Amino acid sequence: ENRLESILSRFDADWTASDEARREAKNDLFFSRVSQWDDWLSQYTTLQYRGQFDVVRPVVRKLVSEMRQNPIDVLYRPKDGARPDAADVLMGMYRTDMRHNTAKIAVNIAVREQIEAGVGAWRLVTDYEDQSPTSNNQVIRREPIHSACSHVIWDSNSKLMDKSDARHCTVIHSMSQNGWEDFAEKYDLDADDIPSFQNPNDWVFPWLTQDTIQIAEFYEVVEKKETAFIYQDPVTGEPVSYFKRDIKDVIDDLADSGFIKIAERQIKRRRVYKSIITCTAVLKDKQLIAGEHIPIVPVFGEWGFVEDKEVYEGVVRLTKDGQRLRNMIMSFNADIVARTPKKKPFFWPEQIAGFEHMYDGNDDYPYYLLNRTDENSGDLPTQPLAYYENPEVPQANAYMLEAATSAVKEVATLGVETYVFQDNLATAMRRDGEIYQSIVNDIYDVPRNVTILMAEVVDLATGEKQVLNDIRGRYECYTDVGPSFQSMKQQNRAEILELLGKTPQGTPEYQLLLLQYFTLLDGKGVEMMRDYANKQLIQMG
Amino acid sequence: TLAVDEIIETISAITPMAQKAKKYTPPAASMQRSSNTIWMPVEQESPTQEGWDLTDKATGLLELNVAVNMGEPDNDFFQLRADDLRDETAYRRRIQSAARKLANNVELKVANMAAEMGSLVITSPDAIGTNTADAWNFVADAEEIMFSRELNRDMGTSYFFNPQDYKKAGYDLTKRDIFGRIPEEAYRDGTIQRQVAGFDDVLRSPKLPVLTKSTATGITVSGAQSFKPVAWQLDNDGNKVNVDNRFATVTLSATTGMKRGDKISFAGVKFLGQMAKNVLAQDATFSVVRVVDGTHVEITPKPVALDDVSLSPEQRAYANVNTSLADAMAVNILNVKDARTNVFWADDAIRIVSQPIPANHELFAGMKTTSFSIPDVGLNGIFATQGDISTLSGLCRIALWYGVNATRPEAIGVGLPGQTA
């Protein structure tokens, strides 16, 4: 019955259920980022040579650059039967608040972790902005999550790559002491009460974080029927507004502005709650947050289920054995080169007694002299001169070094091309588009277009807080995937050029050329060209 | 020979008492300094006088308290060896067996604490199948004593049978030669009912301890003793140290044959109504908590007497016995035969204080520590592993810290059937 007990029970179930995949992914990250000699007993006995001759990092860099040369973003398209322009406002808002460095960096980190370990993730958050808000004095931004495999833990009863069927998800935060002070300042927490949460470290990882702070955020999605209200717009039509969004803030200001209530319906919808937990206590219990979906977006590489157990894999997990064998063989060969007696002659002391300076290595002499006779035997025994054998690399060592290198080369081929990884990133971007759309309908001021202009029907309460009013005709556009553009003008320029590339040189080609000069940037020469296009199109009607 | 990883499952337990008892997790930072014990106040009782001229008769105030502390961790230290192929498959199941064992141990502690600190005792002179509706009478006696003592039962009440007496109750139900709904349920399944004689939950708990007979005989109170409610007392240095309200040390003639959990009752003292201070007809029953020395024992319900004249009125406000100890009264023993106990309580009388073991700190670097949820019961411990210096081996430790406290021994009870001979 205890809130903390239920939270910790679910979290522990998820953790132990996903233990193996996270273990292998963490080993992949350590292997591909810190060292390929991932053993911890080394710091106990002797030293011995341990060289690292990497052959998988060039492949990882190639795959990362291939996936970086083709950026992907959301593209909102109007639904069938809707207005042809029903997605322009949402698309412009999405581009405005995703044109920043944080969004690109979050996606890039997730992609790199997807290639190396097998899973990455990023997060969507909302904040308050007064200088340049996107809408309603708020912004929606995208944030990175490093080490998603071990820092984001999903509901174990999920069978979808994008994790849209997970009911809860826990995200672990590690921050410095000043960062914790700021976190507590932002969430009205007690900074003195230091928080503690799970963050196990690998045995092989040799360093200490020190003076760090761990905490967890538990997101849960609850689907329920909540009361909704039907009004009549003092302009035209009947809007539908949720009871929880104007329960008391403008429940009477709606009437005062002149909204007549017609009916009252029960509508099933999803709400997202966030909690801040530690291993001993609950700090914030069920703070309701914006949107219908959990704001964490995961990206996977090779993904599947084997026996009700999720397995994901990047590109490194299969090259590890051959790479380790190659390192071991090359270390053995280096030892052979270093610690082995060199090729020198074998002498008896009596053979060269008295001529020892002739054999030290000088070039002051024309020949080498040997002692011939002995005072007991009469003559020294004759035996052909032998030399210590030159060091060699064993045939087994050479064969297995070549075989290990060939095995790594053969197994480190993604696809033939990164099409599958690109498609999984496209799926992640579609999930991101869904989450962003829900959050926008929850917090932003979406204008509704009529066929008579754009209407922003909102009002203010007695506490000087403007409450957004969103009709239920909100999901008028769906999500697709297209090239990444920084602004609507850039997208329009690209579309005009695309049409120009296929329209034959008739009058529509003139129309499209004049449109392209229309939508150009602004110095002075392009200003004159733009004005010329303006006048030509206007006069042509 | 072919081992085949086809687990022959053999055991299956249950922890009703432990999953039912309330759980409390006080702040660890303060509980480290306060020596792992904390104090909780008790509901206040007011003295009352009637008259017109009440000069120089203005009482003070007095609020009693109880102390709840914690025991020692219950571990599952074991050693894991790679390069065995028998410690590879056994470890995965050893973790689960450890979790089940820890849950069972918690439940055992809860049951033992309730049985050896339940002040209210309901004894019967014969077995349960001797008479018709005898199990109902057994449950209704407990309900009646709780009602008469006017103990707080808002949270709930619960009665735990052992399998023997539960089966006897079911047999009594089915022998009725009439089949309605209750007899048909007691026929199809062994269940008597989920609520019997007013209790809100009547279960059977397989791990109920057996209260062995007491060979204590011919024992009398040695000298008159007056026990006074108090909330603190002065120590040797002049400091004020709080006093636990749920214990009283009596001096007997000879405490030979007594042990922790003996149910006793002095000859002449009777229960009160607590709130109304009306004398019941029942003999006041106490439970021996400790056999200290050789002529002292420690009984759990402090016997504050109503007729005591050394009690200041605000102390007499807490009286729960009609008469004090009279320096020769016989202390009768209620557990005269070995009998597995049936245990009833109010749901807010047992708590399970819990603490964490912060092994995720920077200090314990090199050993990997995660949380570990004990199933059934609502408790969380640690699971820590660390490998050896060499030889490709390891160590695992599953640890859990808790302490079972009975804050209301007067609300915990015990049922002893067949108390003849």
From Swiss-Prot, chain A:
Keywords linked to the UniProt accession: Capsid protein, Late protein, Viral capsid assembly, Viral genome ejection through host cell envelope, Viral genome packaging, Viral penetration into host cytoplasm, Viral release from host cell, Viral short tail ejection system, Virion, Virus entry into host cell
GO CC annotations, alphabetized: viral portal complex
Biological-process GO terms, alphabetical: symbiont genome ejection through host cell envelope, short tail mechanism; viral DNA genome packaging; viral DNA genome packaging, headful; virion assembly
Compartments, as annotated in UniProt: Virion
Main subcellular localisation: virion
Signal peptide: none
Effect of V299 to A/T/M/Y: Overpackaging
The keyword Nucleus belongs to this UniProt entry's keyword annotation: no
Record flagged with keyword Zinc-finger: no
Family statement: Belongs to the p22likevirus portal protein family.
Protein's job: Forms the portal vertex of the capsid. This portal plays critical roles in head assembly, genome packaging, neck/tail attachment, and genome ejection. Procapsid assembly may initiate with a nucleation complex composed of portal and scaffolding proteins. The portal protein multimerizes as a single ring-shaped homododecamer arranged around a central channel. Switches upon genome packaging from an asymmetrical conformation in the procapsid (PC-portal) to a symmetrical ring in the mature capsid (MV-portal). This change of conformation may serve as a signal for headful packaging.
Subunit structure: Homododecamer. Interacts with the terminase large subunit; this interaction allows the packaging of viral DNA. Interacts (via C-terminus) with the head-to-tail adapter protein gp4; this interaction participates in the head completion. Interacts with the scaffolding protein; this interaction initiates procapsid assembly, thereby ensuring incorporation of only one portal ring per capsid. Interacts with the capsid protein.
The protein, known as: Portal protein
Taxonomic placement: Viruses, Duplodnaviria, Heunggongvirae, Uroviricota, Caudoviricetes
Swiss-Prot record, chain B:
Marked site: Essential for binding to the capsid assembly scaffolding protein: D5
InterPro entries associated with the record: Phage_coat_Gp5 (IPR024659)
Ranges that cross the membrane: none
Keyword Translocase attached: no
Main localization of the protein described in the UniProt heading: virion
GO BP terms, alphabetized: viral procapsid maturation
Gene Ontology CC terms, in alphabetical order: T=7 icosahedral viral capsid; viral capsid; viral procapsid
Keywords: Capsid protein, Late protein, T=7 icosahedral capsid protein, Virion
Source taxon at top rank: Viruses
GO molecular function (one): identical protein binding
The keyword Chaperone belongs to this UniProt entry's keyword annotation: no
Gene3D superfamilies with a match to the protein in the record: 2.40.30.240
Recorded consequence of changing Q233A: Cold-sensitive phenotype probably due to an assembly defect
Region (I domain): 214-336
Outcome recorded upon mutating W52 to N/V: Drastically decreases capsid stability
Effect annotated for changing K368A: No effect on phage growth
Subcellular location field: Virion
Residues the UniProt record annotates as site (Involved in capsid stabilization and maturation): W52
Quaternary organization: Interacts (via N-terminus) with the capsid assembly scaffolding protein (via C-terminus); capsid proteins and scaffolding proteins form building blocks that assemble to form the procapsid. Interacts with the portal protein.
Function per UniProt: Self-assembles to form an icosahedral capsid with a T=7 symmetry.
Family: Belongs to the P22 phage major capsid protein family.
Notes on the domains: The insertion domain (I domain) plays an important role in the folding of the capsid protein by acting as an intramolecular chaperone.
Name of the molecule in the record: Major capsid protein
Gene source species: Salmonella phage P22 (Bacteriophage P22)
Taxonomic path: Viruses, Duplodnaviria, Heunggongvirae, Uroviricota, Caudoviricetes
